[PDB]
Write an enzyme that holds these catalytic residues in place. Structure first.
Site, PDB file in Angstrom:
ATOM      1  N   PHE A   6      51.924  35.547  26.501  1.00 16.10           N
ATOM      2  CA  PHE A   6      52.036  35.096  27.877  1.00 16.10           C
ATOM      3  C   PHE A   6      50.989  34.050  28.173  1.00 16.10           C
ATOM      4  O   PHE A   6      49.801  34.249  27.884  1.00 16.10           O
ATOM      5  CB  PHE A   6      51.797  36.249  28.844  1.00 16.10           C
ATOM      6  CG  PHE A   6      52.944  37.222  28.933  1.00 16.10           C
ATOM      7  CD1 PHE A   6      53.851  37.154  30.004  1.00 16.10           C
ATOM      8  CD2 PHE A   6      53.132  38.197  27.939  1.00 16.10           C
ATOM      9  CE1 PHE A   6      54.933  38.079  30.097  1.00 16.10           C
ATOM     10  CE2 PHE A   6      54.201  39.103  28.032  1.00 16.10           C
ATOM     11  CZ  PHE A   6      55.105  39.013  29.105  1.00 16.10           C
ATOM     12  N   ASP A   7      51.378  32.974  28.840  1.00 16.27           N
ATOM     13  CA  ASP A   7      50.397  32.179  29.583  1.00 16.27           C
ATOM     14  C   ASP A   7      49.902  32.993  30.784  1.00 16.27           C
ATOM     15  O   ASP A   7      50.582  33.939  31.222  1.00 16.27           O
ATOM     16  CB  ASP A   7      51.047  30.876  30.054  1.00 16.27           C
ATOM     17  CG  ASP A   7      50.034  29.890  30.605  1.00 16.27           C
ATOM     18  OD1 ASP A   7      48.871  29.913  30.160  1.00 16.27           O
ATOM     19  OD2 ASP A   7      50.413  29.142  31.511  1.00 16.27           O
ATOM     20  N   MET A   8      48.713  32.677  31.298  1.00 19.56           N
ATOM     21  CA  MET A   8      48.143  33.476  32.397  1.00 19.56           C
ATOM     22  C   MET A   8      48.561  32.921  33.747  1.00 19.56           C
ATOM     23  O   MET A   8      49.400  33.519  34.445  1.00 19.56           O
ATOM     24  CB  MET A   8      46.610  33.576  32.251  1.00 19.56           C
ATOM     25  CG  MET A   8      46.067  34.449  33.300  1.00 19.56           C
ATOM     26  SD  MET A   8      44.115  34.593  33.215  1.00 19.56           S
ATOM     27  CE  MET A   8      43.620  32.797  33.704  1.00 19.56           C
ATOM     28  N   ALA A 106      47.485  33.666  26.296  1.00 20.20           N
ATOM     29  CA  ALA A 106      46.910  32.367  25.966  1.00 20.20           C
ATOM     30  C   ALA A 106      46.711  31.637  27.307  1.00 20.20           C
ATOM     31  O   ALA A 106      47.622  31.604  28.156  1.00 20.20           O
ATOM     32  CB  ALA A 106      47.785  31.571  25.002  1.00 20.20           C
ATOM     33  N   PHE A 163      56.044  33.058  26.966  1.00 17.22           N
ATOM     34  CA  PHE A 163      56.383  32.777  28.374  1.00 17.22           C
ATOM     35  C   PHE A 163      55.375  31.764  28.886  1.00 17.22           C
ATOM     36  O   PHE A 163      54.151  32.043  29.013  1.00 17.22           O
ATOM     37  CB  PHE A 163      56.366  34.071  29.199  1.00 17.22           C
ATOM     38  CG  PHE A 163      57.497  34.983  28.835  1.00 17.22           C
ATOM     39  CD1 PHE A 163      58.769  34.767  29.388  1.00 17.22           C
ATOM     40  CD2 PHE A 163      57.338  35.970  27.857  1.00 17.22           C
ATOM     41  CE1 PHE A 163      59.836  35.564  29.012  1.00 17.22           C
ATOM     42  CE2 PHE A 163      58.412  36.770  27.445  1.00 17.22           C
ATOM     43  CZ  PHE A 163      59.682  36.556  28.022  1.00 17.22           C
TER      44      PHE A 163
END
Length: 216
Positions: A6-8, A106, A163
């Protein structure tokens, strides 16, 4: 599948919409008004050059150092008060763990800053691997960040799902050899740029859970 990445920001929670209130409070602390019309334009550039412009736009007479500190303080307060997890994202993280699949984060955001946010939202406990923007030489769209996530997970890119929520993020994951990239969107018709960069589909945060049920 062996991992989900996942991106944050813009996937697990969204800070961008709170920038107006943070900058409005800064202006207010100096006895100055602030408009969404100015703010919309201020947001079209990196914060590093945006802040000094804001200060002069608002005719604030302080040092840049002092101004930046005030911005720092107001963002903390606003984020602390109003930053919440996106709907359905916790259930999605819980689901990946339920499948005994590795979960990674990430983000371009530096480690210390990012962990503060995740801790406040109690989302930090889910992740097996987390890579931050101050841990690579070159950030998105360079694939470095996703290559390091893959390294730390010890998994091949054809066995991960990502994502992502920015053109540069999608480009970076694709350049790292990852094919299954979903573009996470927030509004009525955004996301064309994510598809053009190689995202395989667009999803709202609430839709991520059903994607995982489909692909895991």
């Amino acid at each position: 599948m062996e991992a989900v990445i996942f991106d944050m920001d813009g996937v697990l929670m969204d800070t961008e919409p709170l920038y107006f209130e943070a900058y409005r409070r800064v202006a207010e602390s100096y006895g100055k008004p602030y408009t969404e019309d100015l703010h919309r334009r201020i947001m079209g550039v990196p914060e590093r050059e945006g802040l000094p412009i804001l200060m002069e736009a608002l005719e604030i007479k302080d040092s840049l150092e002092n101004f930046k500190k005030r911005v720092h303080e107001e963002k903390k307060r606003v984020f602390s008060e109003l930053l919440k997890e996106n709907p359905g994202v916790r259930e999605a993280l819980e689901f990946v763990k339920s499948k005994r699949i590795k979960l990674a984060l990430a983000t371009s955001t530096p480690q210390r800053e990012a962990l503060e946010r995740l801790r406040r939202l109690d989302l930090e406990k889910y992740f097996d691997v987390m890579v931050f923007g101050d841990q690579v030489k070159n950030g998105k769209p360079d694939p470095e960040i996703y290559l390091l996530v893959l390294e730390r997970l010890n998994v091949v890119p054809e066995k991960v799902v990502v994502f992502e929520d920015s053109k540069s993020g999608v480009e970076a994951a694709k350049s790292a050899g990852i094919e299954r990239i979903y573009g996470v969107v927030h509004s009525l018709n955004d996301g064309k740029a994510l598809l053009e960069a190689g995202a395989v589909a667009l999803v709202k945060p609430e839709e991520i859970l059903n994607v995982l049920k489909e692909v895991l």
